[PDB]
Amino acid sequence: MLTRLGAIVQRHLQLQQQQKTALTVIRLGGIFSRRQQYQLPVNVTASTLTLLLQKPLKLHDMEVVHISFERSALEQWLSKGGEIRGKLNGIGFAQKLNLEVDSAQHLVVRDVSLQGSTLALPGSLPGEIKQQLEELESDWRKQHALFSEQQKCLFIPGDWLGRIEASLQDVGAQIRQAQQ
């Protein structure tokens, strides 16, 4: 488990350093004529995610407080181009909005008065680390349950119990720190 917990804890801190709330539009490499964009990676994974805005506007002769876009349709407009279709207030059909790219790397939804409105994403242990940490923690409890029943053997020296128990508590003290 030291070769496994020593890598998961090292991977846990590797992902924690990677990551009020604004949506910063990011770019990719390669060589392209115009400018292609893309949504956030591991931050958002839902198909029908919602996006918040600061200054409200009057779109389609009505007010709106949150605009939801489709993940399958957002990957095509930000890469192939054309027009985007999105509903309002999570209801109705996916109407066409006047969304374009901003100079400050944001999503400005234009209206009939040419107004600015910077969009934002709602705020929230990765799923990959949690899947491997729970499987490793269950393996430590199974090995500790076997030792917590056969330790009463009379033919075992007393000085060995001070090193076997210390090796198990050292692993348990480290596996409970990364899950905090």
Partner: peptide, 13 residues
């Protein structure tokens, strides 16, 4: 047409 250009551009270099 409106197809992917980055994929077609990698073969040029």
């Amino acid at each position: 047409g409106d197809v992917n250009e980055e994929t077609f551009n990698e073969a040029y270099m």
